[PDB]
């Protein structure tokens, strides 16, 4: 590739980093340093209290929620020996999940997804992980995460997380994220179940608006889940010195889970295409029915007006005052042609 | 043979800027033979040929500077994409300038050719006016370090000015898209969707022009010819990232425009329903009435409907009754 240089964007100082995001409301740093027998946990807002955890024998977990503060992330990167380009990728939000291996750390970018039923908004939030020799750094974007089970496991000494190093912590965090992807998928299931009956019963503009926004949402889900699958494949097929061989079997389960997730996404895309077809069919059927009404009226009453005009023209030679002064046979002709048209329409099974 | 392909065939002028660390000479001439010995100056020089339709001047310039006629064909081939060709003598570059005006939402380009020879740069334009005015000001008034450097830095400055013009065009397109988003999400119409189509075509052309530009910059800084020389490579590395920014913005704009166009265009069958409902509710209540008029307009002698207790008001009352019941029935059908 290239030599891992800085971007040097335009209209901007040569060596500055810009937070490429929207959330600029909250900031906090939670440190959870756990060992075999005892642990510490605290939440502060000053970065000077979390740096001395770099040279910690016991595994520790430093969660910086809120990366709009470029000063704190820059200080953390300077202390922990993080490359400036890695910091730039940490702050840059508009990028797909990815994994990079370095000498002293492994740097991963993943994404959380929150589906709000109101307004049907699928929000994506980057979460970045850096696994160092002893400590795991997680940079979030805003308050709210899916690692509460991991925090409960660490606090309550549940599972085997308290007697394993930081690589198992990274595995647990990635596993929690992939597990929450399943909850996102089942929410998509429920919303699609809601959508289908509205599509096939109330075909209006909001229906196709929602359907197309959801097609875009599933395209985004595919585009963000395939790189996650590649990340996990590179994770369990490489085995950098940072992670030990005793944890590699744990990543295969996460890989299988992501395989299942990708299959579910493909099924979702197929269902979405079918649903759009259903909408088109229903709308065409409605216009076909109103069109039946129009063509029935036109077919029945066009030849009648034709023959009325035929017998209504001013010509000198009318064989008209014949067969009971003409009018009754004309009325009978109208009646017989009308009943013929009605019967023919009945033989076709509409009106 | 040399044939001009473009359509700008009304302007021609030669502009020469020979600048050193302490001296500068700028002039405008229309004689090809006067500017030829400028290769003798060890100091960098900048020759600008504004008119391509005068093929004699470019032919003579190629003859004197010794460039293989395929580059002449490429220069005169206006319909092209940005490209880079490397030779043991000179570097050939084809770029595209862009012009955008807010009133008439249309985009027009202008191919510009650059040839970098030993201590010399030649640029072939197509008409009066370009985007290299800041470079001219920097050379003339000794603002930056352009004088202290050779012609490679001059090529750098020209490409950088072109990229800044690309940024300005992107700002204009951003304003256009911001207007169009509300214009189509509030009051959709045929004119708005036509503007959306035009914007999509403009974005397609812009991306088709910007991707080869990124490739040209990559080839410019990655594998360095002796002409480029090391001291300019860190500068050429920046324009690649500028092109990265431009390409990312173009991709985002294209995605937004495509999404908006699809969102509008996926709602044609509802309009079909509306027009069918209108035509049906209008023609359903008038064909019976015209039929009744035809029945009562026949030329029948001794017809029963001669005079029956105000027959005309009775007939119009009957037709009004049937029209009223038919129009009421359609409301029951939600039409």
């Amino acid at each position, epitope marked *: 590739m290239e030599e891992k240089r800085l971007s040097a*964007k*335009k*209209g*901007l*100082p*040569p*060596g*500055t980093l*810009v*937070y*490429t*995001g*929207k959330y*600029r*409301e909250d900031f906090e740093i939670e440190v959870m340093n756990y060992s075999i027998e005892e642990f510490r946990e605290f939440k502060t807002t000053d970065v000077e209290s979390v740096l001395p955890f770099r040279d910690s024998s016991t595994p520790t977990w430093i969660n910086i929620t809120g990366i709009h503060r*470029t*000063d704190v992330v*820059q200080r953390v990167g300077e202390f922990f020996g993080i490359h400036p380009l890695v910091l730039e990728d940490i702050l840059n939000v*508009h990028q797909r999940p990815k994994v990079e291996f370095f000498e002293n750390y492994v740097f991963i970018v993943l994404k959380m997804f929150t589906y709000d039923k109101n307004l049907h908004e699928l929000e994506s939030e980057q979460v970045s992980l850096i696994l160092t020799k002893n400590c795991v750094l997680m940079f979030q974007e805003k308050i709210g995460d899916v690692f509460d089970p991991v925090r409960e496991r660490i606090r309550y000494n549940r599972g085997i997380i308290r007697k394993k190093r930081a690589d198992y912590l990274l595995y647990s965090l990635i596993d929690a994220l992939v597990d929450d992807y399943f909850v996102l998928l089942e929410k998509i299931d429920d919303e699609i179940d809601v959508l289908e009956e509205e599509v096939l019963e109330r075909p209006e503009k909001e229906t196709v608006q929602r359907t197309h926004q959801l097609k875009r949402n599933l395209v985004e889900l595919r585009k963000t889940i395939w790189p996650l699958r590649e990340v996990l494949s590179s994770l369990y097929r490489d085995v950098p010195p940072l992670i030990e061989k005793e944890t590699v079997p744990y990543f295969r389960d996460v890989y299988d889970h992501t395989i299942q997730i990708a299959d579910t996404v493909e099924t979702f895309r197929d269902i979405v295409s079918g649903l759009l077809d259903v909408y088109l069919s229903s709308v065409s059927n409605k216009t076909n029915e109103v069109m039946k009404v129009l063509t029935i009226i036109a077919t029945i009453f066009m030849p009648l007006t034709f023959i009325a005009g035929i017998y209504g023209m001013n010509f000198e030679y009318m064989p008209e005052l014949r067969w009971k002064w003409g009018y009754p046979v004309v009325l009978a002709v109208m009646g017989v042609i009308a009943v013929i048209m009605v019967v023919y329409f009945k033989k076709k099974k509409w009106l | 043979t040399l044939v001009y392909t473009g359509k700008y065939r009304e302007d021609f002028e030669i502009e020469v800027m020979n600048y050193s660390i302490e001296e500068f000479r700028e002039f405008k001439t229309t004689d090809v033979e006067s500017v030829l010995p400028f290769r003798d100056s060890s100091t960098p020089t900048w020759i600008n040929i504004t008119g391509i339709h005068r093929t004699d001047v470019v032919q003579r310039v190629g003859e004197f500077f010794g460039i293989h006629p395929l580059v002449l064909e490429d220069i005169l081939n206006v319909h092209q994409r940005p490209k880079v060709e490397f030779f043991e003598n000179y570097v050939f570059i084809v770029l595209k300038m862009f012009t955008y005006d807010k009133n008439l939402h249309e985009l027009e380009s202008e191919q510009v050719s650059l040839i970098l020879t030993k201590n010399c740069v030649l640029m072939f334009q197509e008409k009066i006016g370009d985007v290299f005015d800041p470079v001219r000001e920097r050379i003339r008034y000794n603002r930056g370090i352009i004088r202290k450097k050779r012609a490679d830095y001059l090529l750098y400055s020209l490409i950088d000015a072109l990229v800044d013009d690309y*940024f*300005v065009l*992107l*700002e*204009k397109i*951003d*304003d256009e898209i*911001d*207007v169009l988003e*509300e214009e189509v999400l509030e009051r959709p119409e045929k004119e708005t969707v036509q503007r959306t189509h035009q914007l999509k075509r403009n974005l397609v052309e812009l991306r088709k022009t910007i991707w080869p530009l990124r490739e040209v910059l990559s080839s410019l800084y990655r594998d360095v010819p002796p002409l480029i020389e090391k001291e300019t490579v860190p500068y050429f590395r920046d324009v690649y990232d500028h092109t990265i*920014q*431009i390409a*990312d*913005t173009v991709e*985002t704009f294209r995605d937004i425009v495509s999404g908006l166009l699809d969102v509008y265009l996926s709602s044609v069958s509802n309009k079909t329903n509306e027009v069918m409902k209108v035509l049906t509710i209008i023609a359903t209540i008038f064909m019976p009435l015209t039929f009744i008029a035809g029945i009562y307009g026949m030329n029948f002698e001794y017809m029963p409907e001669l005079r029956w207790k105000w027959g005309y008001p009775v007939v119009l009352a009957v037709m009004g009754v049937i029209a009223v019941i038919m129009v009421v029935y359609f409301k029951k059908k939600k039409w």
Partner: antibody
Framework: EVQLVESGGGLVQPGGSLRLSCAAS????????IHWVRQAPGKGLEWVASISSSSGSTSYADSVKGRFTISADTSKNTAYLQMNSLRAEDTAVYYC???????????????????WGQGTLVTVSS | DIQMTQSPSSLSASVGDRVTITCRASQSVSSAVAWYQQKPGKAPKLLIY???SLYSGVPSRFSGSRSGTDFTLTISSLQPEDFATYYC?????????FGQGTKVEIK
């Protein structure tokens, strides 16, 4: 926690140079831009200068270009503005603001000033 | 440079009504417009950045909208604490410029 405090304002004769110091407390000046904003008495806000301490890249308004000078000292966490050849209309209150870059598109960025200083009044007369 | 013409130059409105102030850029700015509020005799307080987003720590009544080069600030329901001078600022270029201000009075 973050505080911006200016100093150095006072009466100066025309053509006399005085330095305005913007002491920065609660943050590191190296990670943020520092902008000076001049407000004439009874007039609207006007931008005058800017500085990026990380790279030492300055930006001056056309009204003070080549006459003023802005410098930032990361060691003492302070940004200094030097106003040589001070003229008559420069009499105004000077605000020091810390700005942060935000992202709009891949090609466009903008800066917004979170915290402003108290503002020191500079008077040029007599 | 870029001139940011702000209108109206002075607005009068009581408490509880919607107030709209507009500023027009001379040329294109890519939504890099911020809105600041200054009480008489105090430092300005930032309200709007990116011409739509809301700064963290201001009432939600303030809103920002953009249409081409027209940037509008709207207060949905005024309060006695919202009678100050409002300034636009374009930051697309390195040389940033301010609006001339819009003092909001009472009736």
């Amino acid at each position: 926690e973050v505080q911006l405090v200016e100093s150095g304002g006072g009466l100066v004769q025309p053509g006399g140079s005085l330095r305005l110091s913007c002491a920065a407390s609660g943050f590191n000046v190296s990670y943020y831009s520092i902008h000076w904003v001049r407000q004439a008495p009874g007039k609207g806000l006007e931008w005058v200068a800017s500085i990026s301490s990380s790279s030492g890249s300055t930006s001056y308004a056309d009204s003070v270009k080549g006459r003023f000078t802005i410098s930032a000292d990361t060691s003492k966490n302070t940004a200094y503005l030097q106003m040589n050849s001070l003229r008559a209309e420069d009499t105004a209150v000077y605000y020091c603001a810390r700005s942060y870059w935000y992202y709009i598109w891949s090609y466009s960025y903008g800066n917004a000033m979170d915290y402003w200083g108290q503002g020191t009044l500079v008077t040029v007369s007599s | 440079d870029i001139q940011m013409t702000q209108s109206p130059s002075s607005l009068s409105a009581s408490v509880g009504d919607r107030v709209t102030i507009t500023c027009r850029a001379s040329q294109s700015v890519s939504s890099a417009v911020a809105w600041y509020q200054q009480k008489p005799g105090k430092a300005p307080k930032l309200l709007i950045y990116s011409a739509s987003s809301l700064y963290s720590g201001v009432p939600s009544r303030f809103s920002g909208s953009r249409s081409g080069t027209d940037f509008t600030l709207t207060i949905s329901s005024l309060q006695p604490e919202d009678f100050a001078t409002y300034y636009c600022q374009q930051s697309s270029s390195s040389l940033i410029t301010f609006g001339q201000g819009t003092k909001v009075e009472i009736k």
